Structure formats: structure tokens, C-alpha cells
């Protein structure tokens, strides 16, 4: 193949943290960090409300006994609810000893993470997924899988940025950050929401792009370059994301680990696009892949 | 709505450690008071072309190992050799220590990957014990002693322990008794492997989870016979398919309402005819790393 592959964060910390929560019959997962317990509000839903649920008004008639948490068969007190956007905030009369140094970050478009599949509160696999452009991922959920959780690890430190909330007709997921603020245009109620055309995430091309050329695949590179609006007016003719300044400055480290500036590295796949690969292949494949990170790149090529 | 997933890896991370020889740092696993790795630690550059390891373990000493859990060294009380596995004994049992066995994988047969690097996990991700028993792995330098695994229940089955990796960029390692896949030796050369073919019944199941998933272009109304559809896969460097495979595809065949022998002639056009630009489940290749078993567990939310 490429040399490279989907590498997930190892799950243990975020397995460390995974409960479930039930309000009647209705049991998703939820995220105990210290003494709070975060989870999809759409947990205090019954079938009926969920065509056009009224978070307000069913919130007021909850009390704390009316949320069973459990962390496998052992039930974790509930002593404070709220609501904050999409998630619930339930209190809990004990601080998770297993809570790992943590933070709460929303990610951008084209941003990968890990994502902790669970069941029941039980982890049943770890996979990479990418933010697509259009705010949905590429996930495998199942029914119960409401909760599950997606994260970045730097250092000691997990970053949650997603949780997962529903499935869109075409497929793909949707949700929420931890503060529950879906990405993306969608709401959490049980009616038919279409996705965005998707585009192909430049970023991670070009982070693709410097990836071959770490591994001496460079006969794309070309001797011009680009301004930043000229290759971004190309780049939506192709259905590629524009890029952003945000962009540029990721792609920092591959320019200086390689020497081609981003602008040139642009140039190069802008000709790509107006010319075609001409049955020439790069790291391997015909196809270019736009899921990988700069981040990505650099722990597969130098660790 | 399928993904290559690896098992969570909560239960390996608190059995990984550090383990030190004069210059050489690679991995252990801590199960019990017994602390598992590639005895090639020993080696020396003067050793590490042709060494004797019986007689280069004699020579060294318990207070020779560094072993360090976190941020606390454990004590080497005793060691031995088994095949290609170092086993030191040390005081301390890790009170982390999972349900576990050690089995030995076949060929076709899917694991996850837990990659460290001086003790600490990396990354994680899901490999096949490919027919030429190498793995095409994601390993980098220190990253030996990392371990592959999966998980039934509460049970870890650990399977593969990384050693080397060849001059094609797979990999190669033991089993958890030290017993190397394939015919490859822990001495310091550049070896090749045997010509590798592409695992018939896992490229099936895929494509049993391609219609599943909606993707169904593939799909024609012919048929074929066993041995037929054999003779095409050994000409394409295909494993034969058995009647166990055929039988373990049942489930699969079952819930797709399209017999096994059907599904190998679509696999049969798909060989000699190409994909012609079209994708399945995303990929311009025909995925060969998930087993019938993974499609299912997949497909039914095993935790
Ligand atoms: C763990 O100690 C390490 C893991 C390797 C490092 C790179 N990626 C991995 O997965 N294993 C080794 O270093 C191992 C040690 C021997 C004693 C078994 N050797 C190894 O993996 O060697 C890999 C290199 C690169 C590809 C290749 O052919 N070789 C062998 C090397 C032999 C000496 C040489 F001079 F001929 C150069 C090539």
C-alpha cells in the first residue's frame, strides 16, 4: 500500500470515563469527567416527543431520581441536572477517580479524531474518523450508540471534540462538541436533514502531498506558485475546499521538514487538478486521500 | 457505515512498560509479575548479525534490565528465554492485569495493533496475519514489543509481538511464546518474504458489507462453482477458497439473501475485468483485512 493507515489514539482514558444514562426505557452512553456526567439530551425523549421535542419544557418536568447513570451495573447518584445547547449536565455525588487530565475543543473541518464506539455504556471499538467539510463524519453507529465520544490525545491531556447524536439519511453522523453545539447546521429531533454537498479537504491533500514527498514520490512539483485567492477560486471549480489562513499556518511543519513552501506545494495541486494524473500514481494510488491531517503525517513519518 | 475498527486497547495500555539493555529501549508487557519481550534487547552491534542468545543471556545479569512502569523502575528478580520472548520476573504484579491467553493466529486471521514507543502507547489499529505471515504494519524505531490482540468478553487473546520489519516495509514478530509468523529470524539482516496473495474469504465479507451498506453495483446474476471460482483466485494470487470458508460466509449469505458462490462470481468479474473508476465502501481497491467475523461483530454492536 501507501505506508500509511487509519491510526486511532489508544482508547484507555476515554474507556476510563464511558457511562451509561437511562431515562425510562431509553439508554445512550454518557462522558463522566470529575463529578459531572455529559450525555445527548435527546436521552429524555420518548418516541412520540422526538419528532419535535420540546428540550425545555420536558427538562422541567425531570428530576434528579428520574436519571439512572450507571457505570456497568453500578449506579452513580445523580444530585443536579441542566442543559447546555444539545447535552445534559447531570451532577453526580462522585468524582470519576479515573478522570485523565482533559479539555474541550471544537474542531475544525478536515480535523480528525478518534472515535470511542460504545454500547450500554461498553466500548466496542475505536476508529479514526475526519470532520468532512459539510459537518458530518463517516462513522459506524449502531442504534445505542448515542453518546460515544470523539477525542484527540496530546500529551497526557485527551481533547473531547465530539459526541455523537444521529444519522442522517444519506448515511453519515452528526453531532455535537462537548458543550453541545451541533457541527454544522443540523438539530437534534427526529425529522429528515440533509447533509451539504461534501468537497474534497484541501488541507489534508496537500498534507498528502507533502507526505509523498517525505517518502521521495516529488514528481508533481512544479517550479511556480500561487497566490493564496487565485489557487482558492481553482480550488471550488474542483469542488476542494478553500483554504484558510488556519490552513497555511498547519501546514508549517511539513514546509520547513520539506522545503517547498505552501504556496508552491499549492501550485503543484492546482496542476494536479487542471491536468490530471495522467496514469501517474502518488504514494501508490491514483487517488489522492483527504484524511489525513498534517498532524497525521508527521506521526506516521517521524513519530 | 462500516470501518476498519480495532478493538479498544484500555485493557493492553496498563500492561505496557519500558524495558532497557545497555543503548536499547524497546517494550514490555506486564502480566502478573512476568514482563514479556523481544530478546534481541540484549543484542550489541557486534552481536546483533549473528548472536548466540543462549550465550549472550548467561552473561548478563538481573540489575542489566531496566524496567520502568511510568514513572516507578521494577525490580528484575529472574529471567528467561522462551524462543525469541524474554520473560523477567519482577517483585511487583501488575494489579492491571487483564483476563488473558496467548494463542497463535492464522493466516487471514485480523487483529488490533497497540503501537508504543519507550513504553508508552501510541497509537492503535486493526492488521491481518497476512498468507506470506507478515503484517503491514505501522512500526517505527523503539516500537518493538508493542503487541497485537483481540478481545472476547473480558478476555484479551494476545497474538503478535513486533520485532523487524523487512526491507518491502511490512513486519514481522512472534507470538507471545516467542515463535516467530513465518520464516523470518531476529538477527540484524534484510529479509524477504515469501509472495504474499490476497485473503479470498475477507475480500468476500467485505463485499457482503458493501450490499449491506447499500452498495450493490457490483452484484451480477451469474453464478459460479467452487472450484471454478478456485482456479480464476490461484491465477490472480487469491487463497483458495474452502468449504469453511464457504460455510462460515453462511450468516453473511444469509442476511443478504445472496449466496456465497453468487458473491464469487461478482468477485470472479471484479478480477478480470477491474473496478473501471468505481469505489466499494469507499476504496478503489479491494479490501482484504476484515474477516467475516469482523463484518458481523460490526454489523451487530458486540461490546
Ligand atoms: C525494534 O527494536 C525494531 C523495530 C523496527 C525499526 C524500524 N521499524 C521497525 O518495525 N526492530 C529492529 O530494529 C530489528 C532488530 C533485529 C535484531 C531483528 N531490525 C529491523 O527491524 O531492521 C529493519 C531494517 C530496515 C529494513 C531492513 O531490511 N532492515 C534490516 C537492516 C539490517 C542491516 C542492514 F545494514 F542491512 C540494513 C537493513
Wanted: proline residues 4%.
Amino acid at each position: 500500500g501507501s505506508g500509511f493507515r487509519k491510526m486511532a489514539f489508544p482508547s484507555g482514558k476515554v474507556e476510563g470515563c464511558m457511562v451509561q444514562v437511562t431515562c425510562g426505557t431509553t439508554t445512550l452512553n454518557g462522558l463522566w469527567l470529575d463529578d459531572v456526567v455529559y450525555c445527548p439530551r435527546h436521552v429524555i425523549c420518548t418516541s412520540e416527543d422526538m419528532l419535535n421535542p420540546n428540550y425545555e419544557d420536558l427538562l422541567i418536568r425531570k428530576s434528579n431520581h428520574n436519571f439512572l447513570v450507571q457505570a456497568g451495573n453500578v449506579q452513580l447518584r445523580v444530585i443536579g441536572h441542566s442543559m447546555q445547547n444539545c447535552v445534559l449536565k447531570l451532577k453526580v455525588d462522585t468524582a470519576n477517580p479515573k478522570t485523565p487530565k482533559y479539555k474541550f475543543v471544537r474542531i475544525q473541518p478536515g480535523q480528525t479524531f478518534s472515535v470511542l464506539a460504545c454500547y450500554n455504556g461498553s466500548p466496542s471499538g475505536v476508529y479514526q474518523c475526519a470532520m468532512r467539510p459539510n459537518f458530518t463524519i463517516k462513522g459506524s453507529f449502531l442504534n445505542g450508540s448515542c453518546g460515544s465520544v470523539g477525542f484527540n490525545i496530546d500529551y497526557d491531556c485527551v481533547s473531547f471534540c465530539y459526541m455523537h447524536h444521529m444519522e442522517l439519511p444519506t448515511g453519515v453522523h452528526a453531532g455535537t462538541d462537548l458543550e453541545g453545539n451541533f457541527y454544522g447546521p443540523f438539530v437534534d429531533r427526529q425529522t429528515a436533514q440533509a447533509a451539504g454537498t461534501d468537497t474534497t479537504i484541501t488541507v489534508n491533500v496537500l498534507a498528502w502531498l507533502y507526505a509523498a514527498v517525505i517518502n521521495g514520490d516529488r514528481w508533481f512539483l512544479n517550479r511556480f506558485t500561487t497566490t493564496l485567492n487565485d489557487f482558492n477560486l481553482v480550488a471550488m471549480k474542483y469542488n476542494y475546499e478553500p483554504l484558510t489562513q488556519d490552513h497555511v499556518d498547519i501546514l508549517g511543519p511539513l514546509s520547513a521538514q520539506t522545503g517547498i513552501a505552501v504556496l508552491d506545494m499549492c501550485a503543484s495541486l492546482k496542476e494536479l487538478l487542471q491536468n490530471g494524473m495522467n496514469g501517474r500514481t502518488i504514494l501508490g494510488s491514483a487517488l489522492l486521500e483527504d484524511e489525513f491531517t498534517p498532524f497525521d503525517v508527521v506521526r506516521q513519518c517521524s513519530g
